[PDB]
Amino acid sequence: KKKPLDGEYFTLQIRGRERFEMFRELNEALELKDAQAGKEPG
Amino acid sequence: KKKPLDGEYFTLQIRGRERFEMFRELNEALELKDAQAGKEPG
Amino acid sequence: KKKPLDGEYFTLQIRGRERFEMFRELNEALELKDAQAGKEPG
Amino acid sequence: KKKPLDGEYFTLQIRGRERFEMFRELNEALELKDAQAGKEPG
After folding, report:
1. Which residues have C-beta within 8 Å of that of residue C20, sequence separation ≥ 6?
2. Partner residue opposite B7 with nearest CB, options A6, A7, A17
3. B17: nearest CB among A8, A14, A19
4. Under CATH, what is the fold of the domain C1-42?
5. Which parts of the sequence are annotated with region: Oligomerization (chains A, B, C, D)?
6. Cβ-count burial of B25 within 10 angstroms (0-12 exposed, 13-18 middle, 19+ buried)?
C-alpha cells in the first residue's frame, strides 16, 4: 500500500488486555495525525 | 518467573524507531509502578 | 466555539519541557481523532 | 522539597475526566521511574 517500505516497523509485548486497547489507541491516534500530513497542504 | 501466567500477553506493531523507544518507555513505566504494588505494604 | 461546555476541563502540571511537548502531542492526537468523529458519517 | 527548582514546570489542559485520570497516571509513572534514579546506585 503506497510502498509501506517507509520507516522500519517494530513490535512490543503489552501485558494486560485493558492496557493493550489503551496503547493501540495511542498508536492509531498518532497514525491518524501522521496520515493527515499526507494530504496536500491547503 | 513467579508464574508469569497472570494477565494475557499481547503484541502491537509500532512504526518508526523513535516512536518505538517512546512507547517502550511507557510500557516499562507502568510495569515499574505495577512492580511496586508487589512489595509488601509498609 | 460550538458550546465548549461539553466534558468538564481539567489541568495537569508536567515537569520537564521535553516531556511537556510529548504529552501535548498525545492530547492533540486524541483530540484529532475525537474531532474526526464530529464529521457526518460517510 | 530538595530544591524543586530543577526542571521548569508547565501545565496542560486535558478535556474529559476519564482522559485526565489516564494522563495523570502516565505523569506519575514517569515520575516514579525518575524518582528511582535518585536512589544511590547498587
Report:
1. C14, D10, D12
2. A17
3. A8
4. p53, subunit A (4.10.170)
5. 7-38
6. middle
Question: What are the Cα distances from residue A37, in Å, to A42, C5, C31?
Answer: 11, 30, 16
- Helix axis angle for C17-36 and A17-36, nearest 10°, is 80
Domain boundaries, chain A: 1-42
Q: How far is B36 from chain D (nearest CA, A)?
A: 10
Q: Which of C25, C20, C39, B15 is nearest to A33 (CA)?
A: C25
Nearest Cα residue to A22 out of B38, D29, D34? D29
Give chain B positions within 8 Å (CB) of A12: 11-12, 14, 20, 23-24, 27
B15-20 contact pairs (CB < 8 A, 24+) = B15/A6, B15/A7, B15/A9, B15/A10, B15/A31, B16/A7, B16/A8, B17/A7, B17/A8, B17/A10, B19/A30, B20/A10, B20/A12
Chain C nearest-CA residue for A23: C26
